[PDB]
Structures are given as C-alpha cells and as structure tokens.
Ligand binder design. Structure first.
Ligand SMILES: *[C@@H]1O[C@H](CO)[C@@H](O[C@@H]2O[C@H](CO)[C@@H](O[C@@H]3O[C@H](CO[C@H]4O[C@H](CO)[C@@H](O)[C@H](O)[C@@H]4O)[C@@H](O)[C@H](O[C@H]4O[C@H](CO)[C@@H](O)[C@H](O)[C@@H]4O[C@H]4O[C@H](CO)[C@@H](O)[C@H](O)[C@@H]4O)[C@@H]3O)[C@H](O)[C@H]2NC(C)=O)[C@H](O)[C@H]1NC(C)=O
Ligand SMILES: *[C@@H]1O[C@H](CO)[C@@H](O[C@@H]2O[C@H](CO)[C@@H](O[C@@H]3O[C@H](CO[C@H]4O[C@H](CO)[C@@H](O)[C@H](O)[C@@H]4O)[C@@H](O)[C@H](O[C@H]4O[C@H](CO)[C@@H](O)[C@H](O)[C@@H]4O)[C@@H]3O)[C@H](O)[C@H]2NC(C)=O)[C@H](O)[C@H]1NC(C)=O
Ligand SMILES: *[C@@H]1O[C@H](CO)[C@@H](O[C@@H]2O[C@H](CO)[C@@H](O)[C@H](O)[C@H]2NC(C)=O)[C@H](O)[C@H]1NC(C)=O
Lengths: 139, 52
C-alpha cells in the first residue's frame, strides 16, 4: 500500500504541498504518477516523473501551476500546487506503476554502436495507489 | 626506311597494361577520400519547385 498526506484546506491564492510515501523503500523501481479526481467529472492525469529520473512529463494544462518532485533519500513523492483555484478543490491520488520503455528509431553506427535513440516510453499500468488526499479551497 | 613490321591492335598488350593502370590509379585516388558508409540510412523523400 501507499500513504498520503492528510486532508488539507487552503485559502485560494497561496500554495499547497502533498506528500506520498511508500513503506520504507520497497517501491523504487516502479514509476510515479499523480492523478486528480473532480467528483462527477471523471479523473485527470496530473503527470509523471518516471523512476530512473530521465522524465518529468506534466500535462501542459497543469504545467504552470503544478510541480512533481521525488526525494530519493527519503523515497517521497512531492506534489506542489500554486494557483489553488476553485477547480483544484478535489482529491489528488499518488500512484505507483510500471511503464514500457520501448526502443523506437535508433541510429546505430557503422561499427555497431548506438549513436542515439528516441526510445520513447509507454505507460503500462498503475498497480499501487495512495489512499487519496482531499484538498479543499474555500473563499 | 625500307622497314616493314606486322601490327596487331587486337592482340596488343599495351591496351591491357594501360587498362590495368587506369584501374590502379582510380583505385589509388579515392582510397584517401571520405568514406560515405555513414549515409546508408532510411531517407524520407518527397517530390521536388518550378520544373518542366
Ligand atoms: C534486439 O533489439 C530489440 C529492440 O526492439 C530488443 O527487444 C526489446 O528489448 C527491450 C529491452 O529489454 C525490451 O524492453 C522491455 O520490454 C518489457 C516488455 O516486454 C514485454 O512486452 C513486449 C511487447 O511490448 C514483448 O515483445 C516482450 O516479449 C515482453 O512480453 C518492458 O516491461 C521493460 O520495461 C522494464 O524496463 C524498463 C527499462 O528498460 C523500465 O523502465 C520499466 O519500468 C521496466 O522495468 C523492469 O525492470 C525493473 C528493474 O529494472 C523491474 O523492477 C520492473 O518490475 C520491470 O520488470 C523493457 O522496456 C523490449 O520489450 C524488447 N522488444 C521490443 C519490440 O522493443 C532485443 O532485446 C534485442 N536483442 C538482444 C539485445 O539480444
Ligand atoms: C550517460 O547515460 C546516463 C544514463 O544512461 C545518463 O544519466 C542520466 O542522464 C539524463 C540526461 O539525459 C538525466 O536526466 C536529467 O536529469 C536532470 C537532473 O535534474 C535534477 O534537478 C532537477 C531540478 O532542477 C530535478 O527536478 C530533477 O529531478 C533532478 O533532481 C533533470 O533536470 C533533467 O530534466 C530535464 O529534462 C527532462 C527530459 O529529459 C524534462 O522533462 C525536464 O523538464 C527537464 O527539462 C533530466 O531529467 C538523468 O538525471 C541522468 N541520470 C543519472 C543517474 O545520471 C548520463 O547523463 C549519460 N551521460 C552522457 C555523457 O551521455
Ligand atoms: C526539401 O525539403 C526541405 C525541408 O522542408 C526544404 O527546405 C525548407 O523549405 C521551406 C519552403 O518550402 C522553407 O520555408 C524552409 O525554411 C526550408 N528549410 C527547412 C529546414 O524547412 C527544401 O526547400 C526542399 N527542397 C525543394 C523544395 O527543392
């Protein structure tokens, strides 16, 4: 299982922080995802930062106001929100999953080396999910 | 003067020797030239502008 920070209430305008912790260090090879769940509006994908540390994809719709960090030493996921508007009043879930790092077009060299490779990675699944943190913004 | 000699352009070996030569010089010059082996890659190509 996973642990998330407790429910939070924030006055709009300032920032909020959410922490997702794994028990000890048993989930390190798996990649990290953040999701949002506006009630009655389905679920949205906040973004992900992978597990090797080579990706930081965050959806552009939330790129400006949302940051996702990972502390290796404590093995802790950090989610920072800045705008904190009425639309952010919802439940944020931390998920641990796995991807498929396929190798697409790659330029081998004459001698047989690997000059470069786009090797774009594909999302496979999100096995482990946090208990969910409710963030309430009230004016 | 007063000299008669048979000739045979077809059995002549000068042509064979000079053909071998020309091949040798052709082989010799391009050896210290850039090897174009890092070009045989899949090319994405489109029809070309103002043409007839
Ligand atoms: C000749 O070149 C080809 C190039 O295509 C190469 O084949 C590919 O090799 C790569 C390298 O392993 C393969 O990438 C892995 O793929 C698996 C999924 O494989 C299954 O599904 C495919 C179809 O998509 C099937 O064809 C295949 O048979 C399998 O059924 C991924 O799951 C792997 O992901 C793991 O590694 C990633 C990094 O590489 C991680 O980011 C990812 O999170 C996964 O982590 C794994 O390891 C962790 C520890 O490191 C562990 O904790 C996790 O639980 C997890 O197990 C990986 O991307 C690719 O599938 C091959 N096929 C294709 C079509 O690309 C040949 O191998 C090569 N021949 C040689 C070198 O002899
Ligand atoms: C030899 O090969 C190894 C692995 O095979 C390479 O090691 C990795 O190299 C990649 C670069 O391709 C590194 O990825 C980059 O890491 C940066 C580290 O940033 C730290 O600080 C920021 C805050 O500024 C933190 O947010 C972050 O988590 C890190 O703690 C990132 O900043 C980079 O992010 C940038 O690029 C990504 C996409 O790549 C974008 O999404 C981001 O927005 C940002 O623009 C990037 O992720 C990776 O860290 C290396 N890992 C290790 C273990 O070394 C070697 O680089 C390679 N060496 C050579 C010479 O080829
Ligand atoms: C071959 O393709 C290249 C790539 O598109 C062409 O170069 C571009 O041409 C357009 C106009 O068609 C310019 O606006 C771009 O600035 C050019 N450069 C790039 C990097 O896109 C080139 O003109 C094509 N050759 C032709 C049409 O004969």
């Amino acid at each position: 299982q996973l642990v998330q920070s407790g429910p939070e209430v924030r006055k709009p305008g300032t920032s909020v922080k959410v922490s997702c912790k794994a028990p000890g260090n048993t989930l390190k090879t798996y990649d990290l995802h953040w999701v949002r769940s506006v009630p009655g509006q389905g679920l949205q994908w906040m973004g992900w930062i992978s597990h090797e540390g080579d990706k930081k994809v965050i959806v552009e719709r939330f790129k400006a106001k949302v940051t996702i960090d990972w502390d290796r030493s404590t093995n802790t996921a950090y989610l920072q929100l800045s705008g904190l508007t009425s639309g952010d009043t919802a439940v944020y879930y931390c998920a641990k999953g796995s991807k498929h790092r396929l190798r697409d077009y790659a330029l081998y060299d004459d001698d047989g080396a690997l000059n470069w490779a786009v090797d774009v990675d594909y999302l496979s699944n999100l096995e482990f999910w946090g208990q969910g943190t409710a963030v309430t913004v009230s004016s | 003067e007063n000299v008669t000699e048979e000739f045979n352009m077809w059995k002549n070996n000068m042509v064979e020797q000079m053909h071998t030569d020309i091949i040798s010089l052709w082989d010799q010059s391009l050896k210290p030239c850039v090897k174009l082996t890092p070009l045989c890659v899949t090319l994405q190509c489109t029809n070309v502008n103002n043409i007839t």
